[PDB]
Design an enzyme around this catalytic site. Structure first.
Site, PDB file in Angstrom:
ATOM      1  N   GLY A   1      -8.136 -14.881  -7.786  1.00 52.38           N
ATOM      2  CA  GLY A   1      -8.547 -14.385  -6.454  1.00 52.38           C
ATOM      3  C   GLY A   1      -7.458 -14.488  -5.411  1.00 52.38           C
TER       4      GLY A   1
ATOM      5  CD  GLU B   1      -5.768  -3.971 -12.737  1.00 50.03           C
ATOM      6  OE1 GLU B   1      -4.660  -4.222 -13.222  1.00 50.03           O
ATOM      7  OE2 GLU B   1      -6.190  -4.388 -11.643  1.00 50.03           O
TER       8      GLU B   1
ATOM      9  CB  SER C   1      -0.277  -9.590  -9.959  1.00 54.65           C
ATOM     10  OG  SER C   1      -0.094  -8.895  -8.748  1.00 54.65           O
ATOM     11  CB  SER C   2      -4.631 -13.387 -12.302  1.00 58.59           C
ATOM     12  OG  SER C   2      -5.749 -12.634 -11.837  1.00 58.59           O
ATOM     13  CB  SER C   3      -5.341  -7.918 -12.704  1.00 59.55           C
ATOM     14  OG  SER C   3      -4.502  -7.739 -11.578  1.00 59.55           O
TER      15      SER C   3
ATOM     16  CG  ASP D   1      -0.099  -5.829  -8.824  1.00 59.56           C
ATOM     17  OD1 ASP D   1       0.571  -5.660  -7.776  1.00 59.56           O
ATOM     18  OD2 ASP D   1      -1.297  -6.147  -8.920  1.00 59.56           O
TER      19      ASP D   1
ATOM     20  CG  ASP E   1       1.361   0.499  -5.614  1.00 61.78           C
ATOM     21  OD1 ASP E   1       0.583   0.721  -4.694  1.00 61.78           O
ATOM     22  OD2 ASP E   1       1.105  -0.182  -6.647  1.00 61.78           O
TER      23      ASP E   1
ATOM     24  CB  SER F   1      -9.827 -16.999 -20.653  1.00 58.79           C
ATOM     25  OG  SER F   1      -9.260 -17.568 -19.471  1.00 58.79           O
TER      26      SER F   1
ATOM     27  CG  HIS G   1      -2.191  -0.950   0.695  1.00 61.66           C
ATOM     28  ND1 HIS G   1      -3.206  -0.552  -0.165  1.00 61.66           N
ATOM     29  CD2 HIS G   1      -2.465  -2.252   1.036  1.00 61.66           C
ATOM     30  CE1 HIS G   1      -4.025  -1.583  -0.294  1.00 61.66           C
ATOM     31  NE2 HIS G   1      -3.606  -2.597   0.400  1.00 61.66           N
TER      32      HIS G   1
END
Ligand SMILES: OC[C@H]1O[C@H](O)[C@H](F)[C@@H](O)[C@H]1O
Ligand SMILES: [Cl-]
Length: 418
Positions: A136, A179, A140-142, A191, A49, A80, A47
């Site tokens: 979940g 994102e 950092s899958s995102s 990330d 960045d 996917s 927390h």
């Protein structure tokens, strides 16, 4: 009962093979190549960045693999491996922020962000994604999805940013913008910097001050767990949680107001003035006295202490002071739980189990509100501690956790090219 599961990373060969097959099964054509980006674990500096602070991520061996082919139109098709019968289809031509329905916003939004940055050569594309970055998990899958897409697009469209660290910051910024602005998911850059700039055997000491150039804002720190007979245990709690539920956005709002109240561009200004003071206690006290709200004082204390913990950790680990490194993990978690209020029982109980069972230290990693813990443990102890957390979860009535092998792995790369 079943023994706790370890989620293995896909090999180069498996990721290429699976992404290529999904692409050929879905689109018939061969893809132009396969790219991949890793997930990440933030060792410490949580927390910080979006407060222009310091961070210390590693890239996991676990990657998202993208098979991609450019198009001569502005159509974007993506599929996917989770949902192989559901192709998502958007068009970049006149696409606006939030214009894309569901998960496909993440890859589509990367092409959009590049076009918005004036990369007019970037048109449509077909892609297929196969990942082993657990959904979940807060790993950092995102970013693995946005950064693999940004690298693949840079390559096929010859933009010239993928082949250098400093160049990759352009692609990082496109991934972050996708994102934040396309998917509507609030994110700092932790990330995406990890996924595209980490190196094997090193942690990325990332300085998030926005005025720094790329060669100023990173420092590869030795992170060889084998040198110290260590193992980085990573446990995905699988605790039920919710992306974009507003909690992460609120923490960001709270820090921005704090900085406004303090008359500083960001809390890193505050943190550095405290850090430089002879009497750091007194410098902190005077800062928190300027914040009337009792929650806002807590949030600022976390950010200020966490930034200094990063420095402390880089020094402890370089000194081989694993006890000190582990205490810094522990103080980071404790701050995230008490001051930043981003933990949940599954995270706190996993951490307590790790601490009670010989971890040098243990903490939640990433945004919080769920997801994963990490622990510095002796080599050979990760499975035992993961199973202790699993047994305790079952006693608590929690969903079973799962674990992942972890070490500092390579950043995003091209995996295959026709
Ligand atoms: O360190 C907390 C992190 O939370 C989430 O993962 C965000 F995506 C990162 O940018 C970072 O703020
Ligand atoms: Cl808050």
């Amino acid at each position: 009962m079943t023994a706790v599961e370890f989620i293995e990373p896909l090999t180069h060969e498996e990721g290429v093979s699976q992404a290529t097959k999904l692409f050929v099964d879905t689109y018939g054509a061969a893809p132009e190549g396969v790219w991949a980006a890793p997930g990440r674990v933030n060792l410490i500096g949580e927390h910080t960045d979006y407060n222009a602070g310091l961070c210390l991520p590693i890239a996991l061996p676990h990657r998202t693999f993208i098979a991609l082919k450019p198009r001569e139109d502005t159509k974007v098709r993506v599929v996917s491996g989770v949902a192989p019968d559901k192709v998502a289809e958007a068009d970049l031509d006149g696409l606006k922020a939030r214009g894309v329905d569901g998960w496909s916003a993440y890859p589509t939004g990367v092409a959009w962000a590049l076009r918005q940055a004036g990369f007019d050569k970037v048109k449509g594309f077909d892609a297929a994604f196969v990942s082993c970055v657990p959904l979940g998990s807060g790993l950092s899958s995102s970013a693995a999805m946005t950064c693999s897409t940004a690298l693949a697009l840079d390559d096929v469209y010859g933009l010239g940013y993928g082949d250098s660290d400093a160049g990759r910051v352009t692609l990082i910024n496109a991934a972050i913008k996708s994102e934040n602005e396309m998917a509507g998911a609030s994110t700092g850059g932790l990330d995406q910097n990890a996924s595209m700039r980490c190196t094997e055997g090193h942690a990325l000491l990332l300085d998030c001050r926005p005025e720094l150039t790329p060669l100023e804002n990173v420092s590869q720190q030795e992170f060889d767990l084998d040198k110290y007979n260590l193992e980085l245990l990573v446990v995905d709690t699988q605790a039920p949680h919710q992306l974009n539920d507003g909690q992460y956005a609120q923490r960001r709002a709270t820090c921005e107001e704090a900085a406004k109240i303090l008359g500083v561009a960001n809390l890193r200004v505050t943190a550095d003035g405290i850090s430089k003071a002879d009497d750091q206690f007194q410098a902190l006290k005077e800062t928190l006295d300027a914040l009337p709200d009792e929650t806002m004082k807590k949030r600022v204390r976390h950010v200020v202490t966490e930034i200094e913990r990063v420095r402390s950790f880089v020094r402890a680990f370089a000194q081989g002071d694993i006890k000190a490194a582990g205490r810094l993990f522990n103080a980071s978690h404790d701050s995230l739980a008490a001051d930043y209020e981003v933990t949940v029982p599954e995270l706190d109980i996993a951490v307590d189990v790790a601490r009670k069972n010989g971890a040098y230290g243990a903490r939640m990693t990433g945004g919080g509100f769920g997801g994963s813990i990490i622990a510095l443990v002796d080599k050979g102890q990760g499975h035992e501690i993961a199973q202790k957390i699993a047994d305790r979860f079952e006693k608590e009535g929690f969903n079973a956790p799962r674990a992942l092998p972890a070490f500092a792995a390579a950043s995003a790369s091209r995996e295959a090219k026709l």
